[PDB]
């Protein structure tokens, strides 16, 4: 091979790799977003092309906005990912495997108050790259398991970030 | 250092890089296909040279098919991996650490129905390359703990992939 | 673009991805230390730079000292990181961010004997490369919940790596 098509062989390789890391610090970033409730921030997580259902939901915003309201306060989540499986499709294109484990608490301002839930799932995202950054561009997901209940009404949540 | 020396040193930089995603790809995928009892996908993350004790298992059959029974429809699990130290020991070879959670809920259909399991380990997999694919060879592991109990029976599993 | 300049870009692209893959790598090793209570190699992973408060403590030794106490055989402690985002800010220092899940039970030997606590945390790490070798230089966390409780009595511990 010649040594500009090795240069350009390597180039393509470290771009891939790149790309990669990219989407794995979104998805680092999705779940913090989410569960810290950090709004204004998990929209630039999502592509502008955006569109959910689930009645759709269009753009960053309006899916956003979604979330406030399905996601209010009185509800601590943890969307914990595991083991990702990255695939680069194309320069602006990729799919990503995740395993979660999703915790759900209920605090007493809820009208759910002292409820728990507890899931896994297998998500595969579909990603893409607009104006040279990388966005989640949909979502699904396999549920492994989900189970209700009531907590044990003795624990003590001593700490919270969404409290007063 | 020379240009085509240069080149090489980036050249097995970048394939060391590549195998070290694809180790933690095939973890995923082995981990995923584990918690959703996808034998067939399973098998294919063992190396043909897998032997395993445990009376032992030879090949990724063996192996694949005692977990089919170690495993059944009506036990729930879910083995989580975080934070991996990958090592790559040669061209074909390799070691990889992860720390796990692991959790088993036994449903109503279980000779152990109402079980639960908890527990962490830290294992080391041995992983290698047979004809230009990463493969896992072995695994073993250090119990953190482990806990049985007798799930509340008010907790309602509301979903459950290996159900009807 | 010249062939040299190509090199040298790809050259520092290189390093940048070894450090964060180093930077995972070293805060696994962290945790597995932390949660095995490996002392002697958890040392190992702090900052020869390392001052905390937490009355301050300076250097690894001190610092482990402190671990070594504030963690007893009597706590079995999983501190679970979760979709980092790294970011590299020059050839000698870098942040990272991770999604902790801890939890904590005290055994029958424990003071606290039957209590848990469960709680997850936004990390942000600083690291340092000293001679050749990355260090994590500091901590802090955003903690997002944490709850106290006592454990269902009925709960059997059945391994444990910090018993007799
Ligand atoms: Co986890
Ligand atoms: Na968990």
Known sequence: MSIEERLEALEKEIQKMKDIEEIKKLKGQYFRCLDGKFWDELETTLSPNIVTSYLVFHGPKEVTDYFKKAMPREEISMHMGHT????????????????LEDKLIFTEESKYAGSGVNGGAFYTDKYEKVDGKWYILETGYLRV????????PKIKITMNMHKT
């Open 84 to 99: 990702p499986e990255i695939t680069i499709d194309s320069e602006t294109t990729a799919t990503g495997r995740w395993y």
């Open 145 to 152: 398991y989900e189970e209700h209940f009531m907590r044990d």
